[PDB]
Amino acid sequence: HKIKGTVVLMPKNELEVNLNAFLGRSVSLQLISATKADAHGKGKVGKDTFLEGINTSLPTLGAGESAFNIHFEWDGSMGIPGAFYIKNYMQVEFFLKSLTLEAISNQGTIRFVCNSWVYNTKLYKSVRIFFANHTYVPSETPAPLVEYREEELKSLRGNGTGERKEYDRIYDYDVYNDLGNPDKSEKLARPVLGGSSTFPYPRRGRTGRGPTVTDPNTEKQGEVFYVPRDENLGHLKSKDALEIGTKSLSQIVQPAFESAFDLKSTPIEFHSFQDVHDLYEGGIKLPRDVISTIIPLPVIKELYRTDGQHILKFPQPHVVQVSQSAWMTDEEFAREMIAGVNPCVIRGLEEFPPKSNLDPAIYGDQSSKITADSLDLDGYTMDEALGSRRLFMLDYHDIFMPYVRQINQLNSAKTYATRTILFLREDGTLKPVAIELSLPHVSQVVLPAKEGVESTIWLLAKAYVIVNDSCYHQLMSHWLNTHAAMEPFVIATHRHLSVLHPIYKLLTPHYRNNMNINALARQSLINANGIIETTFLPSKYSVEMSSAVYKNWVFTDQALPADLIKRGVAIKDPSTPHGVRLLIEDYPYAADGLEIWAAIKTWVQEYVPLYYARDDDVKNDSELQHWWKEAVEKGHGDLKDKPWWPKLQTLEDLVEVCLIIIWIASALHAAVNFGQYPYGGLIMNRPTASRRLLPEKGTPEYEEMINNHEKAYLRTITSKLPTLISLSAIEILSTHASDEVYLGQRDNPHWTSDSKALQAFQKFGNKLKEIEEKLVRRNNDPSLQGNRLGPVQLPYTLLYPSSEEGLTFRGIPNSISI
Ligand SMILES: [Fe+3]
């Protein structure tokens, strides 16, 4: 007869960085039948129904939320509602949370989970439609809803043309042709990444602003880089809009810092290690007009403590919280390769010497010059060490050698291509035993030393290694393997899986804020003269170097067990719980990771069978098949010919693909992202650039090395000004916003009506709490102190599932959210 409903929404003002106006004829809803169809087979549509009154007597409401009453006339000819249209006649958009229809019983309640911005009706080509929270593979869709389902998908795809506007909900692909700024200056031209065999690259979200005047292949600049509207996350609290901090850092803060150095208001260079420690003790003193430009900015103002006049004070990095000098030890240098910011590059060594795969015609003999007899392996012979699998390496030789010549031509950059040899001691810790520093076209081996000028040469050798590692970490482990690799799957999901689809509901929580942070990164982080180019060694070659590495990116090798085996740090072993035996038993990233991997695997294995009983059902799901086809052939289309792509013809394939996607977006990104300021907030520990080669004997640079090793170090690594910018950047990227959604959580508890899926999700969340307790016990186990805490006394918490807000060195978000 009449159906009572409650609409929950958020006015615009609540999510930026008058309630009676919603009443009257301002907002119309029309219910759509799931069971009665018109003559053309489409669900019957009801009459325009308007919000009747405010509902303050609702206790479930959250911050910024308002609830409205509504009553629908729905007679016996109309059936059961499964969807609704909404039309906003106001001039201002609002954020629609939910619609709930009440019935005589609690089972007869129908829930609509919306979470979508609704703009004025005149801006939309099609009326906004929303579905109830029932889950349906395509063949199970109630017949009267079939055409609505497909038409909404078509609306989300668009036609591949047009400039995208703020309120568009159109997902499509384009190449990375929007990073250069040639119309401003020819020196800001950058290669188009993607769509060629020279520069393969994952696609990003299409924006459609059109060509520059000087280069038809490059996309012109804009003040706002479009993302589909519901990707562009609002926040209740402006301090949680961390993603906009990078834009302010580049466009406002960096020019202000630069002015202070131009005017010689502060020393241009660090002169001692104390000058660096000062940054988080008494602070750095800057002119008042610089401070007054910085501290009124949202987000930016949270990065520093200030006296309001002259002081900016950075927070104390975790890595120096117990020992100011432990970072200099060989033990910590080695330990951070398995428990640091970038713990996933080290490889097992099964032959010696290590060899290069580079073309000898271009580079020279590239056989390693390290000799077995020069190494102190704690009394082991090389034969013994290899055979017991105690030798490991951090090999950046082949990755960097193709670019060293171009980098070293730049004015203030000089680098080597490095290899580091590591030995696994009988006590279970890694020992660095040699570093090889190579140039193309002298190339030196450096051995550990604790005394004399040689100990300084060794300290500098470690710095060149970490410059390699930092660049690889930021551009490859972090930017390429998580942010960039994931965006094509986000695009494909929205274009081809209905909101009704079980796999849409499984994956989309692991996409939150991903396209948004990436678009802001294209604008201010990885663009020409952006933050990365300004602060990291390779300058304008940074992003294209990640294209060279993408040539070898393999989707199925992103699975954690596969990665460990590929790198030779584990072996296949069915006698173990996880199917792999670690060659470095105490390996913190891998040992904790395997626990998280297994819990996600169990969740996916218990969810997929709820909707697919047999391999046939996977093959016959046309949305799933279109989704995976497009993700590979367009989204990662430069690699579409590779044989290792799963074909998605079996349940096992579907589980594997979903598990890998969830892994990349949650635990992998967390493990490489949230340690950036904790380890790298001391620039000497994680230098981002090197500016000169090793001094030659008999030069004043060499004499300086003998008499003042701290100054020799600081002249080698990142200069003070880029240090200040990069520390601010990585402080932002290392912070959890207070509205983060962590692994095992979801934003709405009624995301599906299927009680079976809800219970399996409850079990997943409980397992994560069990694992966190297990990991806590590992960090309290004295036998594992050597690798989990190290000389820096910093327990490895980066894979604890839960976290409070802030710069916490722990917590696994669902998604690539920062
Ligand atoms: Fe990130």
Ligand 1 centroid to residue 556 C-alpha, Å:
21
What is the C-alpha to C-alpha distance for residues 659 and 665, in angstroms, rounded to an integer?
Answer: 10
What is the C-alpha to C-alpha distance for residues 405 and 248, in angstroms, rounded to an integer?
Answer: 34
Residues 6+ apart with CB under 8 A from 250: 524, 525, 530, 531
- Cis, bond preceding 353 (omega within 30 deg of 0): yes
Three-state SS for 284-303 is EECCHHHHHHHCCCCCHHHC
Q: Give me the catalytic one of 397, 478, 494, 496.
A: 478
Residues 6+ apart with CB under 8 A from 451: none
Task: Say which amino acid occupies 352.
Answer: F
Contact by Cβ (8 Å): 557, 563: yes
Measured in residues, the chain has a length of 818
Ligand 1 centroid to residue 774 C-alpha, Å:
26
What is the C-alpha to C-alpha distance for residues 700 and 495, in angstroms, rounded to an integer?
Answer: 63
Phi/psi for 116 (5° steps) reads -150, 140
Q: How does 520-544 read in b/e, with b if 16+ C-beta sit within 10 Å? A: bbbbbbbbbbbbbbbbbbbbbbbbb
Ligand 1 centroid to residue 672 C-alpha, Å:
8
Closest alpha carbon to 322 in 589, 672, 673, 682 = 682
Cβ neighbours of 204 (radius 10 Å): 27
Ligand 1 centroid to residue 721 C-alpha, Å:
23
Q: Has 669 been annotated as catalytic?
A: yes
Residue for token pair 């300021």: 677
Ligand 1 centroid to residue 733 C-alpha, Å:
7
Residue for token pair 């670019």: 403
Domain boundaries, the chain: 4-154, 155-254, 255-343, 344-469, 470-816
Q: Give me the catalytic one of 518, 673, 685, 814.
A: 673
Ligand 1 centroid to residue 816 C-alpha, Å:
6
Structure tokens at 337: 């390769």
Task: Say which amino acid occupies 667.
Answer: A
Phi/psi for 118 (5° steps) reads -120, 110
Q: Has 750 been annotated as catalytic?
A: no
Q: Has 478 been annotated as catalytic?
A: yes
| Burial of 146 per CB tally in 10 Å (0-12, 13-18, 19+) | middle
What is the C-alpha to C-alpha distance for residues 251 and 431, in angstroms, rounded to an integer?
Answer: 43
Residue for token pair 């208001």: 265
Task: Say which amino acid occupies 296.
Answer: P
Q: How does 21-53 read in b/e, with b if 16+ C-beta sit within 10 Å? A: ebeeeebbbbbbbbeebeeeebbbbbeebbbee
C-alpha to C-alpha distances, 444 to 17, 31, 369, 375, 690, nearest whole angstrom: 53, 75, 8, 15, 17
| Burial of 304 per CB tally in 10 Å (0-12, 13-18, 19+) | buried
Cβ neighbours of 105 (radius 10 Å): 7
What is the C-alpha to C-alpha distance for residues 564 and 346, in angstroms, rounded to an integer?
Answer: 10
Ligand 1 centroid to residue 304 C-alpha, Å:
21
Full DSSP string of 707-752: H-HHHHHHHHB--HHHHHHHHHHHHHHTPBPTT--BTT--S-TTS-
C-alpha to C-alpha distances, 176 to 204, 211, 544, nearest whole angstrom: 7, 13, 10
CA 680 to chain centre: 17
Q: Has 1 been annotated as catalytic?
A: no
Structure tokens at 397: 């030789």
CA 305 to chain centre: 27
Q: Has 709 been annotated as catalytic?
A: no
Q: Give me the catalytic one of 318, 473, 636, 669.
A: 669
Ligand 1 centroid to residue 673 C-alpha, Å:
5
Task: Say which amino acid occupies 56.
Answer: T
Closest alpha carbon to 41 in 135, 142, 134 = 142
Q: Residue 421: in which H helix or E strand, if any?
A: strand 417-424
Full DSSP string of 427-482: TS-EEEEEEEEE-----EEE---SSHHHHHHHHHHHHHHHHHHHHHIIIIIIIIII
Ligand 1 centroid to residue 515 C-alpha, Å:
11
Full DSSP string of 201-248: ---EE-----B-SS-TTSBPP-SS----GGGS---SSGGG-HHHHHHH
Q: Are strands 53-54 and 66-73 parallel, antiparallel or unpaired?
A: antiparallel
Integer Rg of the chain from CA: 28
Task: Say which amino acid occupies 658.
Answer: C
